[PDB]
Design an enzyme around this catalytic site. Structure first.
Site, PDB file in Angstrom:
ATOM      1  N   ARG A 195       0.678  -1.248   0.023  1.00 12.83           N
ATOM      2  CA  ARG A 195       0.201  -0.151  -0.012  1.00 12.83           C
ATOM      3  C   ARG A 195       0.856   1.284   0.046  1.00 12.83           C
ATOM      4  O   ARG A 195       0.599   2.077  -0.895  1.00 12.83           O
ATOM      5  CB  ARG A 195      -1.058   0.010   1.109  1.00 12.83           C
TER       6      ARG A 195
ATOM      7  N   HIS B   4       0.800   4.017  -2.566  1.00  6.70           N
ATOM      8  CA  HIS B   4       0.398   5.556  -2.292  1.00  6.70           C
ATOM      9  C   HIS B   4       1.290   6.714  -2.624  1.00  6.70           C
ATOM     10  O   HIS B   4       1.028   7.902  -2.908  1.00  6.70           O
ATOM     11  CB  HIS B   4      -0.113   5.704  -0.803  1.00  6.70           C
TER      12      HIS B   4
ATOM     13  N   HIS C 298      -5.775  -6.164  -3.731  1.00  6.71           N
ATOM     14  CA  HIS C 298      -6.406  -6.291  -2.628  1.00  6.71           C
ATOM     15  C   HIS C 298      -6.829  -7.723  -2.276  1.00  6.71           C
ATOM     16  O   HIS C 298      -7.356  -8.028  -1.118  1.00  6.71           O
ATOM     17  CB  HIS C 298      -8.095  -5.758  -2.732  1.00  6.71           C
TER      18      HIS C 298
ATOM     19  N   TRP D   6     -10.303  -8.656   2.365  1.00  7.77           N
ATOM     20  CA  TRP D   6     -11.283  -9.142   1.218  1.00  7.77           C
ATOM     21  C   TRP D   6     -10.951 -10.730   0.919  1.00  7.77           C
ATOM     22  O   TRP D   6     -11.649 -11.161  -0.216  1.00  7.77           O
ATOM     23  CB  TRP D   6     -10.242  -8.484  -0.138  1.00  7.77           C
TER      24      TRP D   6
HETATM   25  C1  HEM Z   1      -9.974   2.711  -6.342  1.00  4.42           C
HETATM   26  C2  HEM Z   1      -8.538   2.396  -6.146  1.00  4.42           C
HETATM   27  C3  HEM Z   1      -8.292   2.069  -4.639  1.00  4.42           C
HETATM   28  C4  HEM Z   1      -8.969   2.258  -3.497  1.00  4.42           C
HETATM   29  C5  HEM Z   1     -10.571   3.105  -3.462  1.00  4.42           C
HETATM   30  C6  HEM Z   1      -8.344   1.503  -2.543  1.00  4.42           C
HETATM   31  C7  HEM Z   1      -9.038   1.791  -1.219  1.00  4.42           C
HETATM   32  C8  HEM Z   1      -8.170   1.202  -0.109  1.00  4.42           C
HETATM   33  C9  HEM Z   1      -8.796   1.242   1.349  1.00  4.42           C
HETATM   34  C10 HEM Z   1      -9.754   2.239   1.832  1.00  4.42           C
HETATM   35  C11 HEM Z   1      -7.900   0.437   2.140  1.00  4.42           C
HETATM   36  C12 HEM Z   1      -7.774   0.427   3.614  1.00  4.42           C
HETATM   37  C13 HEM Z   1      -7.044   0.980   4.237  1.00  4.42           C
HETATM   38  C14 HEM Z   1      -6.978   0.784   5.781  1.00  4.42           C
HETATM   39  O1  HEM Z   1      -8.197   0.678   6.550  1.00  4.42           O
HETATM   40  O2  HEM Z   1      -5.804   0.489   6.565  1.00  4.42           O
HETATM   41  C15 HEM Z   1      -6.979  -0.228   1.046  1.00  4.42           C
HETATM   42  C16 HEM Z   1      -6.048  -1.093   1.416  1.00  4.42           C
HETATM   43  C17 HEM Z   1      -5.161  -1.644   0.576  1.00  4.42           C
HETATM   44  N1  HEM Z   1      -4.620  -1.273  -0.670  1.00  4.42           N
HETATM   45 FE1  HEM Z   1      -6.226  -0.146  -1.851  1.00  4.42          FE
HETATM   46  N2  HEM Z   1      -7.244   1.030  -2.877  1.00  4.42           N
HETATM   47  C18 HEM Z   1      -7.237   1.145  -4.210  1.00  4.42           C
HETATM   48  C19 HEM Z   1      -6.283   0.698  -4.956  1.00  4.42           C
HETATM   49  C20 HEM Z   1      -5.219  -0.099  -4.465  1.00  4.42           C
HETATM   50  C21 HEM Z   1      -3.934  -0.481  -5.460  1.00  4.42           C
HETATM   51  C22 HEM Z   1      -3.987   0.052  -6.913  1.00  4.42           C
HETATM   52  C23 HEM Z   1      -3.044  -1.036  -4.749  1.00  4.42           C
HETATM   53  C24 HEM Z   1      -1.706  -1.632  -4.891  1.00  4.42           C
HETATM   54  C25 HEM Z   1      -1.432  -1.810  -6.275  1.00  4.42           C
HETATM   55  C26 HEM Z   1      -3.812  -1.492  -3.519  1.00  4.42           C
HETATM   56  C27 HEM Z   1      -3.242  -2.094  -2.453  1.00  4.42           C
HETATM   57  C28 HEM Z   1      -3.939  -2.123  -1.139  1.00  4.42           C
HETATM   58  C29 HEM Z   1      -3.502  -2.822   0.082  1.00  4.42           C
HETATM   59  C30 HEM Z   1      -2.274  -4.180  -0.167  1.00  4.42           C
HETATM   60  C31 HEM Z   1      -3.968  -2.580   1.096  1.00  4.42           C
HETATM   61  C32 HEM Z   1      -3.978  -3.461   2.398  1.00  4.42           C
HETATM   62  C33 HEM Z   1      -3.292  -2.484   3.389  1.00  4.42           C
HETATM   63  C34 HEM Z   1      -3.089  -3.199   4.762  1.00  4.42           C
HETATM   64  O3  HEM Z   1      -3.480  -4.201   5.203  1.00  4.42           O
HETATM   65  O4  HEM Z   1      -2.789  -2.275   5.734  1.00  4.42           O
HETATM   66  N3  HEM Z   1      -4.913  -0.581  -3.284  1.00  4.42           N
HETATM   67  N4  HEM Z   1      -7.192   0.280  -0.172  1.00  4.42           N
END
Ligand code: HEM
Length: 292
Positions: A46, A50, A173, A189
């Site tokens: 993440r 970001h 995800h 997920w």
């Molecule tokens: C429309 C695009 C995206 C949206 C709206 C989105 C939104 C989110 C949200 C709200 C979270 C939860 C954060 C938290 O509560 O800790 C999350 C987690 C995460 N995102 Fe996405 N995300 C998007 C795209 C992506 C992309 C493009 C990647 C990587 C290539 C990614 C990788 C991750 C990963 C690995 C997590 C887990 C982080 C953790 O476990 O602490 N995301 N995302």
């Protein structure tokens, strides 16, 4: 516009970066208790996303080059809530290897994490250069989660990503989970939260999803297995172009791996100009391949 020219950290070669990769990989293995035994792999993925995903193709501002996440304005972006835990993990690595640039370190953390969680090899190029505090992008360039497929498509046009790239990147995800206190969404997920697979696409297609409201008063899609999808995730099966690609990756793991690897490398390289005399991309060996 700006031109950002890659400049190799003075005198460094493949062997120096593989050492940094190994230090990250070893710490991932060692600090395994974080987030109920998920480990730091997902938060590092993440974080690399970001820090890269602020890029704007119109004026070449943002992106991974400058490492501007270190500055307070970007560090405190509400969109970046929870990423402090990834930054803290990397801080001792940066002290051990103080010659690596911030952008190289944040991007390499993402590569290392994916590979060590049994994902595809991601070729990686060095040469990002720390830029000054006034090059930090303003808040608001990262995406919201409560929108539909048209928003997703339009949003990713700013990063020069097409439908297949977007769907591939969203497969990340499979990893980690949402945390109520960070984002206002809660739950994972899937079942295997720290193994990189195509499970996201499988769950999207095969689970029975119900629209519910969580304790933060946001709507999310929940299944009886205990999984969740954001509205932006679920929209990939509402849009007929996205759905075709979701079905493809659900039925072909290797194709998902290859497409993810290209799209993620591109994400991490957006906005950067590499001289023709730049070294070729590195492919790092995992700890497992080194017998470590
Ligand atoms: C429309 C695009 C995206 C949206 C709206 C989105 C939104 C989110 C949200 C709200 C979270 C939860 C954060 C938290 O509560 O800790 C999350 C987690 C995460 N995102 Fe996405 N995300 C998007 C795209 C992506 C992309 C493009 C990647 C990587 C290539 C990614 C990788 C991750 C990963 C690995 C997590 C887990 C982080 C953790 O476990 O602490 N995301 N995302």
């Amino acid at each position: 516009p700006l031109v950002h020219v890659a400049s190799v950290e003075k005198g460094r070669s493949y062997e120096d970066f593989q050492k940094v990769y190994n230090a990250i990989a070893l710490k991932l293995r060692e600090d395994d208790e974080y987030d109920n035994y998920i480990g730091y792999g997902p938060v590092l993925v993440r974080l690399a996303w970001h820090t890269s995903g602020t890029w704007d193709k119109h004026d070449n501002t943002g992106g991974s080059y400058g490492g501007t996440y270190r500055f307070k304005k970007e560090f405190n972006d509400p969109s970046n809530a929870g990423l402090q835990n990834g930054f803290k993990f990397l801080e001792p690595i940066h002290k051990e290897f103080p010659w690596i640039s911030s952008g190289d370190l944040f991007s390499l953390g993402g590569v290392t994490a994916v590979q060590e969680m049994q994902g595809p090899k991601i070729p990686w190029r060095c040469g990002r250069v720390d830029t000054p505090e006034d090059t930090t992008p303003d808040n608001g360039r990262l995406p919201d989660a409560d929108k539909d497929a048209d928003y997703v498509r339009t949003f990713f046009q700013r990063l020069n990503m097409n439908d297949r790239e977007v769907v591939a990147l969203m497969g990340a995800h499979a990893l980690g989970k949402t945390h109520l206190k960070n984002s206002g969404y809660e739950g994972p997920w899937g079942a295997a939260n720290n193994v990189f697979t195509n499970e996201f696409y499988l769950n999207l297609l095969n689970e029975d999803w119900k629209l519910e409201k969580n304790d933060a008063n946001n709507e999310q899609w929940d299944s009886k297995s205990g999984y969740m999808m954001l509205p932006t995730d679920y929209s990939l099966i509402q849009d007929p172009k996205y759905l075709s690609i979701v079905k493809e990756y659900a039925n072909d793991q290797d194709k998902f791996f290859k497409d993810f690897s290209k799209a993620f490398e591109k994400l991490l390289e957006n906005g950067i100009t590499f001289p023709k005399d730049a070294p070729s991309p590195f492919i790092f060996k995992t700890l497992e391949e080194q017998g470590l």
